[PDB]
Design a protein around this ligand. Structure first.
Ligand SMILES: Cc1ncc(COP(=O)(O)O)c(C=O)c1O
Ligand SMILES: Cc1ncc(COP(=O)(O)O)c(C=O)c1O
Lengths: 382, 382
């Protein structure tokens, strides 16, 4: 038999979860807020059984159904439904638009430790990639001296995720304005993954640069702040010409979304403030508790507190002292899971060999139990 | 600004529908049976509102949820849920498995006029493609003399769709057995798109070669025979080793399906006979009527009757006589739509310059109206 499957290494993040997600664990590893049940969604978003029952299970359309596009456009595109592309999670919006955007040889600037798929597409397109160092982002701005050297005339795209999964670093409105001015000046396309945009702790929620109506591409999803990762709805906001250029790829991958899913997503987006607000309050409750926990453990752990989003990257001092290598953090996390039923994501998934992602957007009761597990574990090793 | 979207030609099929689908037309162009409403699905598939309400909108898993995988495996994989991959339509299953299966330089045999995405992936992978001529498939078998020259030791894959969209040609159980014997002998992977497998008119429904438990890849979908194109659920049946090799690609495109969608799909597959049977009876009603219509129009139209599925490819004699070129059939279909509100798909979408796809799986009332439109149109031109 000639069957010889092409093999590629899976991203560390997703493989970690395939191997270790399961029942009876304290999962304090997520970059999202814990999921709603469909009952809660129907309640909050005002979805009578009859409205679902009326949906004819027919084809939807290439760009996304008009109702859901409009709801998203009103919140993130200044009401221009023509600049919205509705997709199976933001994962699909990323795959579609970056395949259409990026060219072999293009100079592209990519945020250090960016979400795996955002780093994958420029590499795979054969772009000339320069990294934006994580240390250059501080106090709500990218160091203007760093931005000046990295983004210059001929720079094709600048690709960032703010608030950043997993560190929670983000920009202030002033920082975003300065970033947009540099990309506009050079003609670079700003590519802005706003997965956790709706939850901001230090400065205000960043207005979607997609709403400006220029040559920027931004992503959003219901997966991380809305409690709907299982709905599989995200979007890109971008010029119509880029969006339609994605259709041939969409034609041989997914075709279109379900009108039943699109109805639900439309109602969720219309009720975004209630869905997000309830989960954001719980996350901030957990965050206040996590901050106290971190102060109590400052000998064993250090961190930058998150400026946005619902996860952070604690760094374990014992891994800094012993100094690497990357495999040690994976062992650390495995042992923690084995001995204490507590799940983090090892920093190898994000280019941070000495850290792990700790999510605080899960349920408040389970959060304490996970922290107790981590506490016992750190004590045992010290 | 550097924004320069990469441009590719869209498949003719999907672009035709983007330009010409709409309200107030008689659509007799589809390769599928007309969609159920969600109300009907809940009724037939026994889905209480409470079962939907219980679904937590959390992550599903890379291979597809266990319940839906099992339901599909029982019907098409001889009960081996490990050999099933559940995907966003069969479109995604095709994209995922062919990306993992096909290698540059591989000799691949591809059915003439095959569904666009099935023809795209071997071309794009840089396979060495030989075409299986449509005229070689007759009376339920591929001409053994043709199969002998095309599929030889070192042939990597043979890619076919039976029943065939748009001609409705298919194989008998004997024809399928002979095809499988030739691929098994040479070590070629049979890739078997069974989108319309459940509706067979001349011989029995073909048992899924996926159920054999060898090195074959077969696709199915809820889109064409179940009345659920808008659910966006399909699958591949294939060796587990090929399926898991798709995970890295799935990790940067769709991640996984919705558990809410997976619940519905599981119940639909369990109630497949009722969902399919009702629509199959209506299609056969339309087919009996279409056959009489074709006899009444034998001066202007010829056809091979469909052996399976719910569409056929009538050939318009006036286009044969005047002899091409391909653009004339598109004009023909446009005029038909403009003047008579009746939609076909021009044969340019399927490599058949003188034909158009005529679907008989739509509602019986709308079917007559479409045929009257086509009749008036053919008379006008004669
Ligand atoms: C920053 C970022 N972008 C995009 C995604 C893709 O998620 P989805 O496809 O559920 O929208 C994720 C999820 O991990 C993420 O953390
Ligand atoms: C033969 C064949 N295979 C696959 C597909 C993909 O459909 P879906 O993604 O809805 O399963 C189609 C739909 O046009 C088809 O006709």
């Amino acid at each position: 038999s000639s069957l010889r499957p092409r093999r590629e290494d899976p991203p560390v993040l997703e493989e970690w979860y395939r191997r270790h997600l399961g029942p009876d664990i304290h999962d304090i590893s997520s970059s999202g807020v814990h999921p709603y049940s469909f009952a809660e969604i129907r309640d909050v978003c005002r979805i009578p059984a009859a409205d679902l029952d009326a949906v004819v299970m027919d084809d939807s359309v290439s760009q996304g159904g008009e109702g859901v596009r409009r709801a998203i456009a009103d919140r993130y595109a200044g009401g221009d439904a023509d600049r919205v592309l509705v997709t199976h999670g933001s994962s699909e919006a990323i795959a579609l638009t970056l395949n259409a955007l990026l060219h072999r040889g293009d100079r592209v600037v990519v945020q250090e430790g960016i979400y795996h798929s955002l780093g994958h597409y420029p590499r795979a397109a054969g772009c000339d990639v320069a990294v934006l160092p994580g240390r250059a982002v501080r106090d709500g701005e990218i160091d203007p001296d760093v931005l000046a050297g990295l983004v210059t005339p001929g720079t094709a795209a600048v690709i960032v995720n703010f608030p950043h999964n997993p560190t929670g670093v983000t920009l202030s409105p002033q920082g975003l304005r300065a970033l947009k001015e540099r990309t506009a000046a050079t003609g670079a396309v700003l590519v802005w993954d706003a997965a956790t945009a709706e939850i901001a702790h230090r400065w205000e929620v960043l207005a979607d640069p997609g709403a400006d109506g220029g040559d920027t591409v931004s992503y959003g999803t219901l997966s991380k702040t809305f409690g709907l990762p299982g709905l599989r709805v995200g979007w890109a906001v971008a010029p119509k010409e880029l969006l339609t250029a994605t259709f041939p790829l969409r034609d041989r991958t997914t075709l279109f979304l379900s009108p039943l899913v699109e109805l639900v997503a439309e109602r969720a987006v219309r009720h975004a403030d209630e869905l997000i607000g309830a989960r954001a309050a719980e996350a901030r409750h957990n965050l206040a508790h996590l901050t106290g926990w971190m102060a109590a453990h400052e000998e064993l752990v250090r961190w930058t507190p998150p400026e946005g989003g619902v996860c952070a990257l604690p760094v374990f001092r014992e891994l800094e002292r012993a100094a690497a290598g990357p495999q040690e953090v994976e062992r650390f996390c495995l042992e923690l899971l084995e001995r204490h039923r507590t799940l983090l994501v090892p920093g190898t998934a994000f280019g941070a060999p000495h850290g792990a992602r700790l999510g605080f957007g899960g349920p408040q009761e389970d959060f304490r139990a996970g922290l107790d597990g981590l506490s016992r574990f750190l004590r045992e090793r010290a």
